[PDB]
Structure 1
Amino acid sequence: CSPGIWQLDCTHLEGKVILVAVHVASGYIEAEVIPAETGQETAYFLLKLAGRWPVKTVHTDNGSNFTSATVKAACWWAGIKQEFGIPNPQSQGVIESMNKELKKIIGQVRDQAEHLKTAVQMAVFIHNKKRKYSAGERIVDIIATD
């Protein structure tokens, strides 16, 4: 429910790494394909994310991915705190479910592009605008309510 909360996790597909951020309260996704998991790439993703949306707290299923000096620098600069583990009723399985839907969609569109990263961005677009209201609409509502 809390509106500044995002969960970041990486997945591998086709020998490449997909960084996925889910805005927990709405299910809205931002994702990028990165060459390999690196503190550098995560730091840079975080700086971009935080410049676009109000990021207060980051959750993850892999805490170690946020321990490098580059990533600490990013959270420090952007004023982001990282929760220890994951403390919640209403959001149970949301992030899991969103990551499950994103992958299903990537599968459906994969054939329409040469590059995995193109397919990822198509899937992100599809997911954010999907009317069950859309994640895209839900996140704006939450942030606007102020």
Structure 2
Amino acid sequence: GLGPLQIWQTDFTLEPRMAPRSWLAVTVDTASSAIVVTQHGRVTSVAAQHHWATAIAVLGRPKAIKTDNGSCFTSKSTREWLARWGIAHTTGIPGNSQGQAMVERANRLLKDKIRVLAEGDGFMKRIPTSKQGELLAKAMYALNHF
């Protein structure tokens, strides 16, 4: 009733231990702080939509999503995908202050956990392709359900 508004912050961050699909799309729900992450081979408009599709099935549909002015976020294709869902989009204050400090903190936490868990299993550099999936799920589990 008076609970937090369902606004998300989403960003892409690069992680060479997950190559070839080293681009991680990360979404923080600012109401509950849950984190959602997916892996992509390239940072395109289609990869952001695929990421939000998965986040929507996991967290439910938000009232709005805050992103930066990356092209994969302000392109026509992406503005139409968001309108088809009824989700408002804002790139925040124009010149900002980066009102997406949350996703940026999530990004560092996420890369740390990936590195500790991978090193925990003997992978000092790249994680074998076949192990990437479970480790990513595992880092996401440790970050949400502490």
> Shorter-normalised TM-score: what interval?
0.7 to 0.9
CA RMSD of superposed structures (Å): 2.5
Which residue of 113, 120, 145 maps to 1:105? 113
Q: How many residues align?
A: 127
Equivalent residue number for residue 38 of structure 1: 44
Equivalent residue number for residue 123 of structure 1: 139
Equivalent residue number for residue 75 of structure 1: 82
Q: Aligned partner of 2:46: which letter?
A: Q
Is residue 2:24 matched to residue 1:18? yes
Deviation at 1:72, TM superposition (A): 1.7
What is the alpha-carbon distance in structure 1 between the residues aligned to residue 90 and residue 62 of structure 2? 13
How many percent identity over aligned positions? 26
* Unmatched segments (≥5 aa) in structure 2: 122-126
TM normalised by structure 2 equals 0.73
Moved more, 91-100 or 47-56: 91-100
What is the alpha-carbon distance in structure 1 between the residues aligned to residue 101 and residue 47 of structure 2? 26
Give secondary structure in 1 for the equivalent of 2:27.
Answer: strand
Give secondary structure in 2 for the equivalent of 1:31.
Answer: strand
The alpha-carbon distance between structure 1 residues 46 and 19, as it changes in their structure 2 partners (threshold 3 A), is: same
What is the alpha-carbon distance in structure 2 between the residues aligned to residue 59 and residue 73 of structure 1? 16
TM normalised by structure 1 equals 0.73
